């Protein structure tokens, strides 16, 4: 009582947001530090945070924060300079997976304790809204010079709602209220822990049979049962989230783009979403997502057709193609996706052979490029294109969400896109990436779909905000 227990799937791997791009890390210690601005519960707009007002120069190069009294879980100020040094390890450490979107600051400088100004290189209309994602929170300077990056990592001074009491690897975080928080008034919780539970019903019966308070990542299967069920709540909150399926663009003929596009050709998207999302999903036919900024709702769908299917592949050399297709175990959409690809391509002449693995351990496989094609997914968790964008299209360390896609046009497009000024000019460079990554099928997308969680009846305002974060200072648990 008076903690929060959430069974997760995938587990924390580290508390140094320049590390990570996973979920995993993100939706956990977006609760342990806050950020400059924030995102409101319906993700619309941008809010105060840290921050509690700002100004933009009118060359749109000057950014000035005005910080608010704070203090971080160690009981010292938080201050423009810790704002200053998080906003530049983001850019300059040789860690950091974003290096690329924060290329463009020129300076980021504190003019007295209160007030931090930023200026970038060239204008770019997205750094206000990048400002609140989890990856840009603000971290003690003081401690992390202290203590090392490594240490802080496993141990941070935190400057949002709690601080990390223990972690044990592979199993749980276990966070406690932070009472130095600027809000710590408004958080009724005393403590959270994220439970990694890899397979999906043992996650759902263990908040039935209340040894979880609540879970994430409800099986479509059982939405609708437990929609009927007095004792939980099924949370279906509107999301950022795709699904898609990956391909590693490296390995042989899936470098040519007919044989990627007969693969598209071949996957029945409708009767895929249809049957492994139980009429939860919406088919994906974008990297962006529908209802966010500048998608493109008339982008190409190929229709099922195998037999120009089995001509691209045979006019290109992979009439007797195998697949290595990874598979997270206990994951269910992601099993049934794979059985239904799997008799799908059979029909075209095209074998897959599902791996089954740990998913805490998938990631790592599409980090060192071991599968074929395997199905992942992506939510935003800022109000901008460019996030998604420069992850699944940027040529950054990332390498294109790990397929090693290369199209010499898109890298440069999304540099463009990024610093464009003119918002119409803008919108169009992100319609045409959309249409070239679907050209080229960077990978396949799957489907849309909203967060569905569950909750014991007994617990309050368990709210995931479009761009992923949970409102884990609002909840109540009576
Ligand atoms: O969706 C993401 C990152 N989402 C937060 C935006 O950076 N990663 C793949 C799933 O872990």
């Known amino acids: ?31 342990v530090y806050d950020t ?42 938080i201050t423009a300079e810790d704002a200053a040094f998080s906003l530049l390890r983001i850019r300059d450490n040789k860690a950091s997976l974003w290096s690329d979107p924060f290329s463009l600051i020129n300076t980021a400088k504190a003019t007295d304790p209160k007030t931090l100004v930023v200026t970038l290189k060239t204008p770019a209309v997205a750094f206000l809204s990048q400002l609140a994602s989890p990856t840009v929170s603000i971290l003690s300077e003081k401690a992390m010079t202290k203590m ?27 966070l406690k209220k932070n009472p130095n928080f600027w809000q710590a008034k408004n958080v009724s919780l005393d403590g959270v822990e994220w439970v990694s539970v890899t397979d999906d019903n043992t996650r759902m019966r263990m908040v039935q049979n209340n040894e979880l308070d609540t879970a994430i990542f409800v099986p479509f299967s059982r939405v609708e049962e437990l929609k009927k069920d007095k004792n939980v ?44 999302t139980y009429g939860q999903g919406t088919v994906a036919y974008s990297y962006i997502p529908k209802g966010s900024l500048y998608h493109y709702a008339n982008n190409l769908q190929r229709p099922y057709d195998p037999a120009a299917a089995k001509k691209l592949l045979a006019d290109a050399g992979a009439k007797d193609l195998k697949l290595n297709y990874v598979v997270n175990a206990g994951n269910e959409a992601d099993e049934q996706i794979a059985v239904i690809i799997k008799d799908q391509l059979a029909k075209v002449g095209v074998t897959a052979n599902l791996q089954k693995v740990d998913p805490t351990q998938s990631w790592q496989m599409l980090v060192d490029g071991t599968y074929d094609i395997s199905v992942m997914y992506w939510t935003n968790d800022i109000l901008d294109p ?24 898109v890298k440069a497009l999304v540099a463009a896109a990024r610093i464009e000024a003119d918002p119409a000019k803008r919108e169009q460079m992100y319609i045409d990436l959309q249409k070239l990554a679907k050209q080229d099928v960077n990978w396949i997308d799957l489907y849309y779909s909203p967060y ?6 007994n617990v309050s305002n368990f709210l995931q905000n479009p761009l992923g974060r949970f409102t884990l200072e609002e909840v109540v648990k009576n």
């Open 1 to 31: 009582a008076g903690v929060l227990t959430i069974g997760c799937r995938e587990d924390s791997t580290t508390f140094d947001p320049i590390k990570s791009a996973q979920n995993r890390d993100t939706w956990v210690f977006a609760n």
């Open 452 to 457: 569905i969680n569950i909750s014991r009846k």
């Open 36 to 77: 400059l601005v924030r995102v409101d519960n319906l993700g619309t707009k941008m809010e105060p945070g840290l921050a509690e007002s700002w100004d933009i120069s009118k060359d749109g190069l000057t950014y000035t924060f005005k910080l608010r009294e704070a203090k971080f879980s160690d009981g010292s100020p």
């Open 148 to 174: 090392g990056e490594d240490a802080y990592a496993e141990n941070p001074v935190t400057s949002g709602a709690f601080t990390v009491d223990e972690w044990r690897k592979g199993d749980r975080v276990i």
């Open 233 to 276: 709540v099924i949370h279906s909150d509107p999301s950022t989230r795709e699904d898609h399926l990956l391909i590693n663009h490296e390995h042989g003929l899936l470098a040519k783009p007919e044989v990627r596009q007969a693969l598209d050709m071949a996957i029945d998207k409708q009767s895929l979403v249809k049957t492994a």
């Open 386 to 409: 460019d996030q998604k964008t420069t992850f699944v299209l940027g040529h950054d360390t990332n390498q294109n969400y790990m397929t090693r896609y290369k199209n010499d046009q």
